[PDB]
Structures are given as C-alpha cells and as structure tokens.
Ligand binder design. Structure first.
Ligand SMILES: *[C@@H]1O[C@H](CO)[C@@H](O[C@@H]2O[C@H](CO)[C@@H](O[C@@H]3O[C@H](CO[C@H]4O[C@H](CO)[C@@H](O)[C@H](O)[C@@H]4O)[C@@H](O)[C@H](O[C@H]4O[C@H](CO)[C@@H](O)[C@H](O)[C@@H]4O[C@H]4O[C@H](CO)[C@@H](O)[C@H](O)[C@@H]4O)[C@@H]3O)[C@H](O)[C@H]2NC(C)=O)[C@H](O)[C@H]1NC(C)=O
Ligand SMILES: *[C@@H]1O[C@H](CO)[C@@H](O[C@@H]2O[C@H](CO)[C@@H](O)[C@H](O)[C@H]2NC(C)=O)[C@H](O)[C@H]1NC(C)=O
Ligand SMILES: CC(=O)N[C@H]1[C@H]([C@H](O)[C@H](O)CO)O[C@H](S(=O)(=O)O)C[C@@H]1NC(=N)N
Ligand SMILES: *[C@@H]1O[C@H](CO)[C@@H](O)[C@H](O)[C@H]1NC(C)=O
Ligand SMILES: [Ca+2]
Length: 387
C-alpha cells in the first residue's frame, strides 16, 4: 500500500502535452479562484492540481492587490488535474506556502500560515491535523510549493526560515502519517535553498531548488530517507536554470558553489539527472518570467563546462508570460516518469491593465515516444478582462 517508487526512471526523449486549465480565460466568464504558486501531485490513480488561493475569485472586488504574497486568506486549493478552480474547489488548509504528497495510503499537506516572523506549519494527514511546528528563525518559514515525496511511508519535505539574501536556516523534515519523526539540518555545499522541486530517486529523494542569494545555477539537495543524512551541491550544467541569469554565451556554473552570476532573486524551477546528462526547464528570457523551454544538457549533470544542449522544446513562446515550474513523478507499469507544470502568471505588477494577479497552468509529461512543436500560453486577453 505504501509507495516505494522502486522502479527505474523511464526513458525520456522529451515531453508531451498532458494538461492545461485555461483558468484566466475562463475567469472572464465564470467565477474562478485567484491563485498563484500552483503545482501537481498524483495519488496512485490520478493527478490533482493544487494552488495557493487568494481568498477571492478574479471577477470580485477582493481580487485587487492580490500580488501580495502572504495574507490570512490564502488557502491551499485541490482539484482533479484539469478541473479549473471553480467555487466548489476544496480549500484543504490555510497556507501562503505549502507542499503536498500522497504516500500510497493518504494525502499529506504541509501548510504554513500566520505572521511573517512567527509562522506556523500544519501537518495534515488522511484528513486530520497530526502535527505542527513553529518558525525556527522568525523570518518567513516557507517550503517547496510543489509535491513532497514519500518512500515506505516516510515523507520528506524541505523548509527554509530566514533571510532571502543571505545564509538562511534550511531543514529537511521526515513525516510519517503526518507526525514529524525527525528533522535534519541542510548540509553540504548548497549555500541558499528555496522552493525545492523534489522527486523519488530510489532508495532516496533528490531535489533541485532555488538559490535566491548568489546562485543562478540551481542547488541540489539529496535526502537519505533511512539514515536522514543530507548532502547538497549545484546543478553542474554550464547552461543554468534560474531567472535571472546571464545569457547563454557568457554564463558559467560550478558543481559545488553558487556561480555569483545574477544570483540574487530567482524563480522556482526543476531539473533531473539522466545518467550524466540533465533534463531541465527554464524561462526563455534570462531576466524575467517570459517564455518556457526544456532541453537536455549532455554531460550537464556531471560537467560544469557543458553547454551542449539537445532536444529543446518550446513550452511557452518567448512572447508570453510564464512563472513557476516544478516537477512531479508518476508511477508507470515499468518505470517512474517525470512530469512538470508551468505557472502562467497574468496581471500586476508586470501587466497593469488589471488590478489582480493570478495564473493558469499547463502541464507536460516525459515521453519515450515522439513529439513535435507548439506553444501553449495562458491565452487570456488582458485588455478585455474584468479589472
Ligand atoms: C510566537 O508564537 C508563540 C506561540 O503562540 C508565542 O509564545 C506564546 O506567547 C504568549 C504570550 O506571552 C504566551 O501566553 C502567555 O503566557 C503567560 C504566562 O507565561 C509566562 O509566565 C510563566 C510564569 O508566569 C512562564 O513559565 C512562561 O515562560 C512565560 O514567561 C500569561 O501570563 C499570558 O497571559 C497574560 O497576557 C495576555 C497577553 O499576552 C493577556 O491577554 C492575559 O490576560 C494575561 O494578562 C493578565 O495577567 C497578567 C499576570 O499574569 C497581568 O500582567 C496582565 O495585566 C493581565 O491581568 C499569556 O497567556 C504563550 O504561553 C506562549 N506560547 C508558548 C508555546 O510559549 C511567542 O511569544 C511568539 N513570538 C513572537 C515573537 O511573536
Ligand atoms: C485597490 O487597492 C488600492 C490600495 O492598495 C487602492 O488605491 C489607493 O486607495 C487609497 C484610497 O483611495 C489612496 O489613498 C491611494 O492613493 C490609492 N492608490 C494607490 C495606493 O496607489 C485602490 O482604490 C483599490 N482599487 C479598487 C478598485 O478597489
Ligand atoms: C513564503 C513566500 O512568501 N514566498 C514568496 C517568495 C519569496 O519571497 C522568495 O523566495 C524569497 O524568499 O517569492 C516568490 S516571487 O514570485 O516573488 O519570486 C513568491 C512567494 N510567495 C508565496 N509563496 N506566497
Ligand atoms: C551576453 O553577455 C555578455 C556580457 O554582458 C556580452 O558581452 C554579450 O554581448 C551578451 N550578449 C550576447 C552574447 O548576445
Ligand atoms: Ca538566483
């Protein structure tokens, strides 16, 4: 009954279209939640889309100023994948930062809300509150914004507390049926870790995260579920996956250290190893959240000098807005597959035609077959939306 993910990673040639919800286009002629920080996680049968609501629908006086990151009204929404966040969506917990996963038996939700300097993380398993932890550094306790990972009934999640522009306090929690059974401190050479996109890599858990301090290469966190040990580093690939970052011709990376290239700030992203190669996504703009592309970097997981990409796919064309992206893993008959979602942000502050800030999603899954080309942006006409 417990998921173990003890199958090899599927062969991957690229990614094929899987889901899109068109939520902003629908918002103009229907009651749809205002959201951000979406993600996808699946129970053994089917996938669900999650996001952080703003306690309001879009066509609604309360959508004004929803660019704001943390309010007492934000809640974690959960629908089957492809059901847009309509008024019958379940708010599974109070949260302005979250992570959820299914351990094969039940859902775990990790939900952070409350004051910036004294936030509370609730742990809800199988529909009931089982544990909670207070902010340890009094400076915006925050977590993955994408699925956690469970092996043999032990779920792990990565959480950070402290500065967004300097050394912070990152901890990796081990949760069994909703109870925190152990807490490990981040260790290794990752110098700043946020918004980890984690996946099963039996017998352990591997994460590619966001360095908001000095790195435009992405940190890696490796989690041993048995002995609770932690190691960390950076995605070697000379083509780096954060935003902002330097242009392709002049960017560099490092397997152990942040590259000190437009390292400040960032955006939630993902990557995963395939042998010594690395599959990764990133925005097409090096400076802002415009466009989205995927490709494989040959020797990109082990060689910081490789900028040799192949199998590029445009997910969102450079002229349209993207945003966060994260990984989720889906068990197939013979192998574990890798999928990702792209948050498609519309509104303030970058688009001033409206007062609100929300997103739609588009989702793609690894394939061993073939695929072609396209572009699947949000598609709403911001000039014709309710203000
Ligand atoms: C982050 O979040 C945590 C958790 O919420 C929070 O900790 C909590 O703080 C509150 C507020 O201080 C604590 O509740 C208080 O408990 C004291 C008693 O505890 C103190 O004293 C005992 C020994 O006496 C010590 O063992 C203990 O360590 C503490 O030092 C109560 O006295 C408090 O009640 C009074 O204050 C309230 C407002 O705070 C009033 O509304 C209330 O009516 C009481 O006042 C009345 O009685 C007073 C005399 O007792 C008198 O002076 C007044 O004028 C009035 O007549 C309150 O219940 C709570 O226990 C903490 N929880 C934990 C788990 O530690 C952190 O503070 C927070 N941090 C930040 C930075 O936000
Ligand atoms: C949306 O919210 C903003 C507040 O963030 C409102 O704009 C401010 O409103 C007050 C009161 O009129 C003024 O003092 C400010 O000058 C306004 N502009 C700012 C802060 O830039 C705005 O009224 C709200 N809009 C709607 C339609 O409710
Ligand atoms: C807990 C929290 O507020 N996280 C915010 C992060 C954070 O400020 C940076 O990671 C620096 O720590 O910033 C992003 S962002 O799109 O503005 O990049 C938005 C996030 N908003 C929410 N998750 N509700
Ligand atoms: C990329 O960055 C470097 C350094 O700013 C600059 O010399 C170069 O012209 C930029 N643009 C390219 C290579 O298209
Ligand atoms: Ca960065």
């Amino acid at each position: 009954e417990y998921r173990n993910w003890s199958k090899p990673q599927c062969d991957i040639t690229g990614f094929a279209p899987f889901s899109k919800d068109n939520s902003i286009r629908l918002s103009a002629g229907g009651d749809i939640w205002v959201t951000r920080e979406p993600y996808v996680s699946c129970d053994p049968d089917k996938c669900y889309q999650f996001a952080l609501g703003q306690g309001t629908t879009l066509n609604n006086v309360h959508s004004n100023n929803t660019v704001r990151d943390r309010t007492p009204y934000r809640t974690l929404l959960m629908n089957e994948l492809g059901v847009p966040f309509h008024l019958g969506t379940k708010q599974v917990c109070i949260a302005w930062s979250s992570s959820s996963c299914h351990d094969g038996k039940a859902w775990l939700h990790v939900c952070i809300t409350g004051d910036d300097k004294n936030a509370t993380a609730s742990f809800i398993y199988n529909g009931r509150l089982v544990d909670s932890v207070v902010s340890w550094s009094k400076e915006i306790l925050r977590t993955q914004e994408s699925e956690c990972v469970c092996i043999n009934g032990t779920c792990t999640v990565v959480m950070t507390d402290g500065s967004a522009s300097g050394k912070a306090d990152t901890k990796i929690l081990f949760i069994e049926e909703g109870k925190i059974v152990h807490t490990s401190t981040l260790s290794g050479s990752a110098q700043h870790v946020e918004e980890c996109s984690c996946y099963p890599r039996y017998p352990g858990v591997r994460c590619v995260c966001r360095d908001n301090w000095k790195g435009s290469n992405r940190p890696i966190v490796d989690i041993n579920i048995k002995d609770h040990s932690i190691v960390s580093s950076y995605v070697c690939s000379g083509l780096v996956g954060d935003t902002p970052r330097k242009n392709d011709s002049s960017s560099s990376s490092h397997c152990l250290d942040p590259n000190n290239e437009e390292g400040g700030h960032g955006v939630k992203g993902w990557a995963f190893d395939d042998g010594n190669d690395v599959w990764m996504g990133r925005t097409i703009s090096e400076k802002s959240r415009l466009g989205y592309e995927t490709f494989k970097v040959i020797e990109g997981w082990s060689n910081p000098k490789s900028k040799l990409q192949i199998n590029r796919q445009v997910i969102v064309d450079r002229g349209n807005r993207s945003g966060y992206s994260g990984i989720f893993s889906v068990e197939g008959k013979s192998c574990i597959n890798r999928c990702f979602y792209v948050e498609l942000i519309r509104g303030r502050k970058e688009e001033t035609e409206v007062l609100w800030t929300s997103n739609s999603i588009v989702v793609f899954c690894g394939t061993s077959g073939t695929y072609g080309t396209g572009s699947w942006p949000d598609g709403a006409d911001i000039n014709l939306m309710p203000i």
